[PDB]
Amino acid sequence: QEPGSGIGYPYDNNTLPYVAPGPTDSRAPCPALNALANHGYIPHDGRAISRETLQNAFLNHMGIANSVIELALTNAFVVCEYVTGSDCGDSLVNLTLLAEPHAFEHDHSFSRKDYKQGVANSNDFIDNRNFDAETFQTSLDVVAGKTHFDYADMNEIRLQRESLSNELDFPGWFTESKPIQNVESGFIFALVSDFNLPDNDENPLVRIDWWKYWFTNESFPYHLGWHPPSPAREIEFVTSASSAVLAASVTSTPSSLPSGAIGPGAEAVPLSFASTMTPFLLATNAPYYAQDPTLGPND
């Protein structure tokens, strides 16, 4: 928000306004990075981004401690080298390259289509990067008519997404990614669980309206009473949440799940790509921004 608005106070005492991305700006497949860039906490053009810029933006504007993004930073820079063909040092070339498929970006996302979802032909690909309202509605509808949800519900959401993706993706494309996705499940609990409930830290419940605002608008739900978690969330919360999602008992099983879907997940680890592997072409679509309605500077 505008700095004088005080909308962030006393959790964020140095806010900047929302500015929609323009056609030439670079955006990510990540709703968090996109919100940060839209506010200029990382470059509004989405280019030439250092580790410390990312660390400070998450810590000071989202209540997310450095530990939470340590592996994500490693993997962002691995993917940058893979996509560009050279070491990117400490200047991430852009955010768009993070949508390189079967890498950090993965299938069965909550709010994005898959790279070969619904394609009639094998060499074809689609936008696996921008927010997709229909896809996100498939996640939301698992928890329809509710204001909050728990770990077991999140497990059902990710199972629904895996099912749909396995059914809709071009045969042979679909690749399950439980470890990365369920770190992101933990990220959702870390950011938009309801800290106004007495047992939040131990039994977090996602507030659905906060989640929906964040993802649809790529800005922060201050108007709904959200603020950055204080103290900032740490990696233990995130991986504990990830564990708890996958350990929750499944009471509704979709058909078409890949082998081993129900059960614990491997720890997320650093990515690596063979030097002789050429990257998949990135989708070139302009960055998404909310238009129904468009957002003002304080939204």
Ligand X SMILES: *[C@H]1O[C@H](CO)[C@@H](O)[C@H](O)[C@@H]1O
Ligand Y SMILES: *[C@H]1O[C@H](CO)[C@@H](O)[C@H](O)[C@@H]1O[C@H]1O[C@H](CO)[C@@H](O)[C@H](O)[C@@H]1O
Ligand Z SMILES: *[C@@H]1O[C@H](CO)[C@@H](O[C@@H]2O[C@H](CO)[C@@H](O[C@@H]3O[C@H](CO)[C@@H](O)[C@H](O)[C@@H]3O)[C@H](O)[C@H]2NC(C)=O)[C@H](O)[C@H]1NC(C)=O
Ligand U SMILES: *[C@@H]1O[C@H](CO)[C@@H](O)[C@H](O)[C@H]1NC(C)=O
CB 18 within 8 A of CB 38: yes
Among candidate residues 70, 184, 218, 234, the one labeled active-site is: 184
Token pair recorded at residue 16: 């900047």
Is 241 or 282 the residue whose CB approaches ligand Z more closely? 282
CA 119, 127, 132: angle at the middle one, nearest 5?
105
Q: Binding pattern to ligand Z, positions 59-98, x when CB under 6 A?
A: ------------------------xx--------xx-xx-
Is 58 or 213 the residue whose CB approaches ligand HEM more closely? 58
Measured CA to CA, the distance from residue 198 to residue 94 in angstroms comes to 40
Peptide bond before residue 10 is cis, with ω within 30 degrees of 0: yes
Return the HEC string of 73-99.
HHHHHHHHHHHHCCCCCCCEEECHHHH
285 binds, among ligand Y, ligand X, Mn ion, none (CB under 5 to 8 A by kind): ligand Y
Interface with ligand Y, residue 133, by CB under 6 A: no
* 106 labeled binding residue: yes
Q: Binding pattern to ligand HEM, positions 71-110, x when CB under 6 A?
A: -xx--x---------------------x-----xxx--xx
Is 175 or 285 the residue whose CB approaches ligand Y more closely? 285
284 binds, among Mn ion, ligand Y, ligand X, none (CB under 5 to 8 A by kind): ligand Y
Task: Compute how many residues bind ligand Z; rule: CB under 6 A.
Answer: 10
CA 217, 223, 229: angle at the middle one, nearest 5?
85
The DSSP symbol for 64 reads B
Q: How far is the CB of 150 from ligand Y (least distance, A)?
A: 38
Cα 65 to Cα 164, 230, 236: the distances in Å are: 33, 10, 11
Question: Of residues 233-292, which lie at the interface with ligand Z (CB under 6 A)?
Answer: 279, 281-282
223 binds, among ligand Z, ligand U, ligand HEM, none (CB under 5 to 8 A by kind): ligand U
Interface with ligand HEM, residue 188, by CB under 6 A: yes
Interface with ligand HEM, residue 142, by CB under 6 A: no
- Residue 184 is among the residues annotated as catalytic for this protein: yes
- The span from the first CA to the last CA of the chain, in angstroms, equals 7
Measured CA to CA, the distance from residue 224 to residue 106 in angstroms comes to 30
Token pair recorded at residue 37: 């860039």
How many CB atoms are located within 10 Å of the residue 12 CB? 21
Interface with ligand U, residue 61, by CB under 6 A: no
User: Active-site residues: which are they?
Assistant: 184
> Residues within the annotated binding site?
30, 105-106, 109
Residues lying near Mn ion in the complex (CB under 5 A): 105, 109, 112
Residues lying near ligand Y in the complex (CB under 6 A): 284-286
